[PDB]
Design a protein around this ligand. Structure first.
Ligand SMILES: [Zn+2]
Ligand SMILES: [Zn+2]
Ligand SMILES: [Zn+2]
Ligand SMILES: [Zn+2]
Length: 100
């Protein structure tokens, strides 16, 4: 009788990608140096390396983000850029039409 398993997942950064700002990069994707490029899954309008994506999302505006005033308790959620349209009619904005 016996029993046992094996398997270890681990990935590192890409020397190339890590140093690749150009969105329209066309460098042969090498296993260890540079990976294939992929367009944002939110059609935000940016081209980054599949590996960078994870990081890009952090910046990408489209990325689903909670109301700027999430602290107050706004159950609303939308793109970082589409936060205004909501903030205008948002309760956690305490911003009246006060004009002149
Ligand atoms: Zn690149
Ligand atoms: Zn990469
Ligand atoms: Zn994006
Ligand atoms: Zn809100």
């Amino acid at each position: 009788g016996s029993s046992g398993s094996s398997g270890m997942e681990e990935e590192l950064q890409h020397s190339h990608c890590v140093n690749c700002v150009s969105r329209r990069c066309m460098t042969r994707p090498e296993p260890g140096i540079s990976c294939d490029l992929i367009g944002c899954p939110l059609v935000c309008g940016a081209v980054f390396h599949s590996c960078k994506a994870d990081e890009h999302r952090l910046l990408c505006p489209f990325e689903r983000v909670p109301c700027l005033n999430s602290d107050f308790g706004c159950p609303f959620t939308m793109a970082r850029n589409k936060v205004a349209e909501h903030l205008e009619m948002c309760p956690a904005s305490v911003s009246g039409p006060s004009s002149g």
